[PDB]
Amino acid sequence: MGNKQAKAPESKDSPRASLIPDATHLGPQFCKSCWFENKGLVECNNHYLCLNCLTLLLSVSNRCPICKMPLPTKLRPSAAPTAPPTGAADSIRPPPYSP
């Protein structure tokens, strides 16, 4: 008869299952908002914007419009150059005798 292995790849160009068939959640390394360039590209969490246009609209002065998500929370500075100990065990209220 002629037994041979056959190949059958699936184009899957337009699938009708899974609403987000895309498996990308980071973004390409090319800024598509202001223009194509790699001089100062910065990768947002789920979005890509370069510093050149990022400064004009700020990274997130109020909200990132491309991420389509609000961020009212803030990130702590994670720094503490000053942190002396305190306790004030000695009670204070009356004036000093001052001999």
Q: Is 44 in the site for Zn ion (CB under 5 A)?
A: yes
Of residues 70 through 89, those in contact with Zn ion by CB under 5 A are none
The Cα–Cα gap between 24 and 42 comes to: 17
Q: Could you tell me the smallest distance in angstroms from the CB atom of residue 73 to Zn ion?
A: 15
Q: Which of 26/34 has CB closer to Zn ion?
A: 34
Of residues 47 through 66, those in contact with Zn ion by CB under 5 A are 47, 50, 53, 64, 66
Q: Which of 73/96 has CB closer to Zn ion?
A: 73
Q: What is the DSSP string of 18-86?
A: -S-----SS--SS--SS-S--SSEEE-SS-EEEHHHHHHHTTTSSEETTTTEE----------S-----
Phi, psi (deg, nearest 5) at residue 48? -120, 125
* Among residues 34, 58, 69, 71, the one that binds Zn ion under rule CB under 5 A: 34
Residue numbers at the binding site for Zn ion (CB under 5 A)? 31, 34, 44, 47, 50, 53, 64, 66-67
